[PDB]
Design a protein around this ligand. Structure first.
Ligand SMILES: Cc1cc2nc3c(=O)[nH]c(=O)nc-3n(C[C@H](O)[C@H](O)[C@H](O)COP(=O)(O)OP(=O)(O)OC[C@H]3O[C@@H](n4cnc5c(N)ncnc54)[C@H](O)[C@@H]3O)c2cc1C
Ligand code: HEC
Ligand code: HEC
Ligand code: HEC
Ligand code: F3S
Lengths: 537, 97, 418, 45
């Protein structure tokens, strides 16, 4: 196998980077551990997936788990991901592996970060600020938004938020009854409700249908209205790229000059194969890329590839969420529209961020029919009475999350433990996740606000989780910075020690931020495309 | 041995229409679950004309597949599909069908 | 608007002379599929250097009507000049004013047409139309029928050139006057019969439905797809209501041309209910892709956005070419700047790609349970649609092997006489 | 110097490469040449 630029991981980052590179002309090979997966098969699996896993959100059962490189599932787990620490449940995030990556399932929420977050260390003296500023990434934000076809509230001024040099390609699709009721009630309470920019086609776009409100954005959409990495993967493959499924990259052969020369990957049957290309790029996951780097340790680099500063696996972030579940006094009728339409973005910025995290209130618009139906079934009612019970529980069913900003802590790590193995012997990643008093105070404030919202809406049977919930987007693990001796990757999506290795993934992300933000991973991946160009021009 | 399971509970406490042959799929799956499944169901007709003031386990054929007396209670307000302008001021409020 | 602007909109002139929506209108450079190969539309903006800015009323009409270029070369039959033959000279001169005044000229070239021998030589087409007997006296207002039918005949046969896309061809690729508006394959798609036949045409359509269909392309029983999407979003949707009504009146007077064994109308054929046992399964594979936008019983949306696959003209045809083309490419219409789209499901699909065997499996199921049960789709039937339909008998001569074989035959005759 | 391709074996199974004369032993080819002879007869007239 010979290529010009090798990209490992055909997800959002890998597929967008490959698409841009093959548009630029130079050949690119996509190698991914997962198999070639089709949307129709996942739709069939989800329809035939036992409905008890629909009451409590499951986003991995429809997706097949390949034995050699399984992806984590959180209904009783296969122990692919091991979480340790007082808030190990905060990092209870799930991913799906295969062409298209974890982007096969996602709430389509694409966001632009605040300008303050790019200078977070220089603004509030907490964490590590981004190497570049907002103005240095906004054109790439627009490019990624155009490529994925994001929605957006163009014709309205909302709140202190990300300024835009060019309005969104689409316009925000109208709210359902649930979103309108939530917006009016929070406005009465004192919270501002704001539409969420989603990677959903409010109008036909890029040969894909308009969003018809299937209310199944997670974990698979029957029509393809939302954006997935499979789109960019297919575009790159058609334009000339070569993509190979079942490519589990494990080791990289490096030299004394720190420029990688070869990559070896296992098939399901352990057959290793070597591939040679001028520039090597890894875009796996914020949980898989640091694991792959640690696993590929060679003679030259004992503690890990590109680890002259030893910051890989450290400073892992993932937004801690506070869940909610109850029945409203008045019929919210939640379920219309997409799974995640509105959110409270008023608390995304302020002077309080120097003491506690910026809370991001906002509820879930997924259909309550399955959860309410099985709740009513568990009440033991049968017949007409069961009918009114299911009616009430699906017309008043409400679910709210409350994300936070978790700061980079070097105590966190991604030790690939030897106690649990897999089919190929690759150690299962293990994460020690710590939260810190910052997000503790932020979560106390969020709990107070959630009680306020529940009291305003007359909630009954209130069950907030006593532990911080995950949000399935992995932030950090390979932190940026101008100084190579305190940061591992530079400003141009390049590992400091390995000049010939360009890394572009959520591991590269420097600050967790406030919002569900794989778009920045898309922007940084497109940012690395120019680095490919000047390196081979 | 199929029509008895089809009319097992009642017309009102269930579906006025047919099960669309999902009862045949359900009944054939219950054969491995309970050998005495086919024996108790036939006796239930005479008792209504003991079984469920005290014995509840007979409801496993009633709970199960969700089939929460299903194509739903309100299929005209929530999805699973529908027209894109699905928002029409919540349609009805509590009109069951 | 200008009088010439109306005809230019009506005559579909802007459809073939812009490369999709991105290119400038009337600037040429748009590829159109033909059995002989690809013919590229040349620029029409009145550019004095690279356009037709030097064209005059005498030669612009000759290029539009009789299809000869300024240099003397014969325009390819891809132009509906045979349809445009009846176009009145008092109306053709209106187009010339519109071209020179309204559209802004562009000094930009367009790629030239390249075709294999013997289509390489342009002057050979002069003989072609003589056998096709294009001429073709200019249209004179008919007297035996009312004024509305007079305008209806004007729009369909010669103005909007509806015939050149619907009525079949012969071995020489010429219009067939015997089977007028009978319906034949057009590359990948297939225009259906639109004659007054009740059971085999569009006669059973209600007159109000027919007027609505031609105005927008969206009706409860039929939705415009493929080339009609381009036909409606470009030309017909801008026409006045009276002209569309005039088209409907004319279409009611065309003589009927029944098909090979048709018993019921395509849209009047109901469907039988069915379900799937909860790959390579007609019921199951259709449910994994189609069950969301349509329903499990094929009834479609409640108000009418998604088409009801029962009693649908795309599914009610004996020839499944429209249904297979609908799956392979999807539909994309644009009425009054409101686009509705169906994702493609071909090998190059973006949402979910179905192989040729897969597409046949759903096509067999949907035709069996929602379409005409008589219709059946083979594995290679989809493959023909991908390549651009069945090869026309004339196109086989467009290969270097065949001409060499015929070249020796001519050599045999010369020696034979000696 | 010798090298064997994947289809080289396939030719041996079918009986070696088709001789140029054998291509005329197909009903399609003779029909194509039959029209060419018809062309000459009308051409002289
Ligand atoms: C529930 C959910 C919610 C989400 N919410 C949001 C949101 O709010 N906002 C937002 O912006 N995004 C959201 N997302 C999207 C998410 O952030 C991205 O999809 C994700 O970061 C992209 O990962 P991927 O799919 O590209 O990884 P993949 O492409 O799946 O990673 C593949 C890589 O893993 C490697 N690998 C796998 N197994 C092994 C092994 N055993 N050994 C070695 N290497 C291995 C492969 O070799 C390859 O390099 C959400 C996703 C989910 C599932
Ligand atoms: C798509 C089917 C077309 C429509 C509708 C119209 N034209 Fe056309 N035209 C088309 C082609 C493919 C070609 C060239 C092929 C050939 O045989 O050479 C043409 C040619 C002309 C010309 C000749 C000069 C030129 O630079 O090409 C003229 C003046 C012309 N066409 C004008 C014209 C007008 C006025 C139309 C509206 C009625 C019109 N064309 C429609 C393709 C198509
Ligand atoms: C939603 C994203 C769709 C999916 C998935 C499939 N189809 Fe579709 N189809 C859709 C629309 C919106 C339309 C018509 C446009 C409108 O404005 O009405 C269609 C059209 C068809 C047709 C032809 C109907 C007509 O043109 O009169 C057929 C035969 C058809 N669709 C079949 C079909 C099949 C077999 C599908 C599974 C592969 C399928 N469609 C998926 C929307 C959507
Ligand atoms: C070529 C570009 C066309 C021109 C010009 C016109 N029509 Fe057409 N028509 C065309 C196709 C390819 C199709 C079929 C699409 C599909 O679903 O397979 C059609 C369809 C119709 C119909 C529907 C009939 C039915 O499906 O049984 C009607 C009534 C119709 N077309 C009428 C019509 C008229 C009146 C036209 C002149 C303005 C006309 N068409 C032009 C292709 C083309
Ligand atoms: S997957 Fe598609 S159409 Fe609407 S709600 Fe979810 S988006």
């Amino acid at each position: 196998l010979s290529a010009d630029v090798v990209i490992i991981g055909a997800g959002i980052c890998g597929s967008l980077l490959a698409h841009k590179l093959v548009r630029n002309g130079l050949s690119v090979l996509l190698l991914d551990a997962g198999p070639r997966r089709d949307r129709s098969q996942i739709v069939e699996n989800w329809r035939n997936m036992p409905p008890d896993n629909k009451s409590q959100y499951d986003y991995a059962t429809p997706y097949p788990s390949v034995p050699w490189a399984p992806h984590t599932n959180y209904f009783p787990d296969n122990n692919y991901l091991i979480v340790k620490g007082p808030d190990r449940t905060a990092y209870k995030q799930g991913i799906i592996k295969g062409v298209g990556g974890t982007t096969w399932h996602w709430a389509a929420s694409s966001w632009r970060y605040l300008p303050n977050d790019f200078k977070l260390h220089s603004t509030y003296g907490v964490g590590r600020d981004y190497a570049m500023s907002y103005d240095e990434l906004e054109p790439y934000y627009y490019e990624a938004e155009c490529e994925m076809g994001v929605m957006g509230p163009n014709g309205e001024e909302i709140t202190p938020s990300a300024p835009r040099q060019n309005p969104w390609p689409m316009t925000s699709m109208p709210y359902g009854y649930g979103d309108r009721t939530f917006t009016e009630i929070v406005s009465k309470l004192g919270f501002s409700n704001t539409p969420v920019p989603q990677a959903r086609n409010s109008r036909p776009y890029d040969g894909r249908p308009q969003c018809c409100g299937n209310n199944n954005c997670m974990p698979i959409c029957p029509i393809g209205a939302m954006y997935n990495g499979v789109y960019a993967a297919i575009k790159a493959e058609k334009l000339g790229a070569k993509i190979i499924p079942n490519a589990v990259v494990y080791a990289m052969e490096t030299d004394a000059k720190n420029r990688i020369t070869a990559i070896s990957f296992y098939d399901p049957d352990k057959q290793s194969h070597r591939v040679v290309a001028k520039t090597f790029v890894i875009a796996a996951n914020g949980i898989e890329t640091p694991k792959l780097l640690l696993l590929a340790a060679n003679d030259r680099n004992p503690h890990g590839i590109a680890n002259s500063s030893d910051l890989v696996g450290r400073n892992m972030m993932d937004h801690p969420g506070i869940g909610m579940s109850f029945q409203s006094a008045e019929p919210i009728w939640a379920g219309g529209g997409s799974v995640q339409m509105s959110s409270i973005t008023n608390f995304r910025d302020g002077d309080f961020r120097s003491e506690y995290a910026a809370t991001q209130i906002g509820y879930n618009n997924t259909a309550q029919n399955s959860r309410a139906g099985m709740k009513a079934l568990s009440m033991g009612l049968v017949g007409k009475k069961l009918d009114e019970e299911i009616r009430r529980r699906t017309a008043h069913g409400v679910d709210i999350y409350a994300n936070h900003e978790v700061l980079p802590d070097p105590n966190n790590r991604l030790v690939l433990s030897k106690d649990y193995k897999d089919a190929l012997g690759i150690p299962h990643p293990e994460v020690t996740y710590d939260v810190g008093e910052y997000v503790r105070k932020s979560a106390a404030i969020s709990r107070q606000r959630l009680m306020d919202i529940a009291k305003a809406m007359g909630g009954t049977e209130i069950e907030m989780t006593p532990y911080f919930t995950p949000n399935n987007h992995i932030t950090g693990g390979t932190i940026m910075g101008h100084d190579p001796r305190d940061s591992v990757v530079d400003k141009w999506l390049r590992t400091h020690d390995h000049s010939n290795l360009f890394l572009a993934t959520g591991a590269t992300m420097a600050a967790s931020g406030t919002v569900n933000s794989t778009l920045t991973m898309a922007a940084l991946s497109l940012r690395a495309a120019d680095a490919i160009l000047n390196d081979l021009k | 041995s199929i029509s008895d399971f089809m009319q097992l509970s009642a017309f009102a406490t269930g579906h006025k229409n047919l099960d669309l042959n999902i009862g045949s799929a359900l009944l054939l799956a219950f054969e491995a679950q309970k050998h005495d499944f086919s024996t108790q169901i036939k006796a239930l007709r005479e008792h209504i004309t003991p079984l469920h003031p005290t014995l509840i386990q007979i409801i496993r054929a009633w709970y199960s597949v969700i089939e929460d007396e299903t194509v739903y209670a309100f299929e005209k307000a929530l999805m699973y599909v529908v027209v894109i302008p699905t928002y029409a001021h919540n349609g009805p409020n509590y009109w069951v069908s | 608007i200008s009088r010439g602007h109306y005809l230019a909109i009506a005559a579909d002139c802007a459809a073939c002379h812009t490369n999709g929506r991105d290119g400038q209108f009337l600037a040429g450079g748009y590829a159109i599929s033909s059995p002989m190969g690809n013919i590229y539309s040349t620029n029409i903006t009145p550019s004095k250097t690279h356009g037709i800015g030097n064209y005059t009323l005498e030669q612009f009409s000759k290029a539009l009507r009789h299809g000869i270029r300024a240099d003397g070369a014969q325009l390819y039959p891809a132009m509906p000049y045979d349809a445009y033959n009846r176009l009145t000279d008092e109306d053709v001169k209106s187009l010339y004013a519109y071209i020179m005044t309204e559209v802004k000229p562009v000094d930009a070239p367009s790629p030239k047409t390249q075709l294999p021998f013997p289509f390489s030589i342009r002057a050979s087409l002069g003989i072609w139309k003589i056998a096709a007997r294009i001429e073709g006296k200019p249209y004179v207002f008919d007297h035996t029928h009312n004024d509305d039918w007079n305008r209806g005949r004007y729009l369909v046969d010669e103005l909007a050139h509806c015939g050149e896309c619907h009525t079949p061809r012969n071995f020489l690729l010429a219009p067939n006057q015997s089977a007028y508006l009978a319906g034949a394959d057009i590359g990948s798609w297939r225009a259906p019969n639109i004659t007054n036949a009740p059971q085999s045409g569009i006669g059973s359509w209600s007159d109000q439905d027919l007027f609505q269909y031609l105005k927008t392309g969206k009706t409860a029983h039929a939705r415009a797809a493929g080339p009609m999407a381009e036909a409606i979003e470009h030309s017909l949707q801008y026409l006045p209501d009276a002209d569309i009504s005039a088209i409907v009146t004319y279409l009611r007077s065309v003589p009927a041309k029944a098909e090979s064994g048709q018993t019921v109308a395509n849209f009047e054929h109901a469907g039988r209910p069915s379900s799937y046992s909860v790959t390579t399964d007609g019921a199951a594979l259709y449910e994994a892709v189609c069950a969301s936008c349509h329903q499990s019983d094929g009834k479609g949306s409640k108000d009418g956005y998604y088409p009801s696959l029962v009693g649908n003209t795309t599914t009610g045809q004996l020839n499944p070419n429209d249904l297979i083309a609908s799956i392979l490419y999807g539909v994309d219409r644009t009425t009054d700047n409101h686009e509705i789209l169906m994702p493609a499901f071909g090998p190059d699909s973006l949402v979910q790609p179905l192989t040729d065997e897969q597409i046949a499996t759903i096509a067999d199921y949907v035709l069996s349970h929602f379409g005409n049960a008589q219709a059946t789709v083979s594995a290679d039937a989809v493959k023909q649609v991908r390549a651009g339909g069945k090869q026309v008998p004339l196109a086989k001569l467009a290969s270097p092997g065949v001409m060499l074989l015929l070249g020796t035959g001519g050599i045999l005759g010369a020696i034979l006489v000696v």
